[PDB]
Amino acid sequence: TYSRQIKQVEDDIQQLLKKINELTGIKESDTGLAPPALWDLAADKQTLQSEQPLQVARCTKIINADSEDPKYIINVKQFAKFVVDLSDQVAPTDIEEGMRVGVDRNKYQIHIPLPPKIDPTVTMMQVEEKPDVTYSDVGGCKEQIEKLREVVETPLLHPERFVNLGIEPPKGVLLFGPPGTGKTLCARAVANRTDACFIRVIGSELVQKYVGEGARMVRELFEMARTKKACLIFFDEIDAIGGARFDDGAGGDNEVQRTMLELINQLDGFDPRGNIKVLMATNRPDTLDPALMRPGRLDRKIEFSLPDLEGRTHIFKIHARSMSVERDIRFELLARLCPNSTGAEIRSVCTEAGMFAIRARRKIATEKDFLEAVNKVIKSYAKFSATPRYMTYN
């Protein structure tokens, strides 16, 4: 009944919100200013305290010290090199050589040491955040998980069963099979459960534009990794980063091989990486280099084969546990109809047959809705199939 009466009493109080919030100060949509009722801490005091007593302290880089005296040799970006001194506020302990320090603009003396440069394209490839894939989603390949999981996390979660027995456990592992088998999926489950830094690297990010540029990114990776206590490096699609050394005539693919040699040097020999565990995952391993396939770098060699029969029946129970189905369907009949099929196809069977239920009207799939999806995915897309020239890995 009171059709306008609720409306205009709604409208003015929705306006009376804005009409006084303009009288407080959030307005003047800025080009980089703050909320005005938030900066009141530095409004009178620290405006004249963080500015007028505090100075700029231009940052530099130290070449070396010398004996008998401080007399530090310093360096800046393009300008000259000076001979400098400390302040009183810092000890001469942590002014070690090759270290960035802040330096005043007048006397040129050292104020404070700095953290080193991180080369920010290496900073982005730290994962910081965990996916939602659990080992309960990697069904069908239980023995491959167990032989993997005893290398990555059991020395980290229990570093006493290995020490007191007196064995140094393996450090590297590669994961290889046909595509769509579950290689990248199983690596997501490791980053889910772990606790150390998980630094991922995709092998097509180390190809650079200059000469020797890509080999320096391999160092800055392992520089920040040795600072951490335990860390887990993930290499994906490493058939890009190096296959083999084959140089003939005109030197071709020479530049990528220097990046691959620097990676080999950071894994073995001469005061080693310590507590860093690597994890590669390739698609065709026949191209890879024999000096990289050597144990001590890539100890475990987990195979991801195609599921046999009970591997397949368990995958249907994963990708169709959460969908409206007829109760009386059997999955064991379906797994006999897909002889050499990947786990990726079995998911696409389940997602296709739900669409047939959405095609006409209905709300739950039937047994024949699966069979209409089997011959379309398996036997009608069989021209592509992606597998049979990858079982031979060529």
Partner: protein
């Protein structure tokens, strides 16, 4: 002046170089292969002559170069394309080692695993003198190698290393070391504390990396 070690990659080449760094009390100085490759021109060239001037200063000093085929790739004539800058760091490493103004104060240890890649200008006789090769272990060394890495493990006296060296053919010093670590982990699965002979034989099947396909229809 100048030695060269070469061979298959698991035969132990770093292992002598880490041995000699612990024996002589001189200035040991180590290098990576692709460390002498820089974006700006002349920086890789300047980086070489700084090293042989620093080892000139410490008059007892030996210098080590690992994975020399990063820079020592054979030169080639090509139009329209081709790297040149990496040849500059090599052509000074030829000269700064041997040629004009020689010296006998530093010794060079070089380690590669492939030799046919290399430019013959650095295999001449005087730049790299003694070219020693590291073959794969024949039979008796494989008994000796896995005896070394089985030192810290609780091994029962049921082991025949002459048998274990003989059921491991075509391995190298890395793979023989890799058997001792894998057999030391299979016993942790079954809860045993000592090592038996069958733990090593199961460790060999993991290092060989066989493919399991339903094959019991022979014989």
């Amino acid at each position: 002046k100048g030695v060269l070690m070469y061979g298959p990659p698991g035969t132990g080449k770093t292992l002598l170089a880490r041995a000699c760094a612990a024996q002589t009390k001189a200035t040991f100085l180590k290098l990576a292969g692709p460390q002498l490759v820089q974006m700006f021109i002349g920086d890789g060239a300047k980086l070489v002559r700084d090293a042989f001037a620093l080892a000139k200063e410490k008059a007892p000093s030996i210098i080590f170069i690992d994975e020399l085929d990063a820079i020592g790739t054979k030169r080639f004539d090509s139009e329209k394309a081709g790297d040149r800058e990496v040849q500059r760091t090599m052509l000074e490493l030829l000269n700064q080692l041997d040629g004009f103004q020689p010296n006998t104060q530093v010794k060079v240890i070089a380690a590669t695993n492939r030799v046919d890649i290399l430019d013959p200008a650095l295999l001449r006789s005087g730049r790299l003198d003694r070219k020693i090769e590291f073959p794969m272990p024949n039979e008796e060394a494989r008994a000796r190698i896995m005896q070394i890495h089985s030192r810290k493990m609780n091994v029962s006296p049921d082991v025949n290393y002459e048998e274990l060296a003989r059921c491991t053919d075509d391995f190298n010093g890395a793979q023989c070391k890799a058997v001792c670590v894998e057999a030391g982990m299979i016993a942790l699965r079954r809860g045993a504390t000592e090592l038996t002979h069958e733990d090593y034989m199961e460790g060999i099947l993991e290092v060989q990396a066989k493919k399991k396909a339903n094959l019991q229809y022979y014989a």
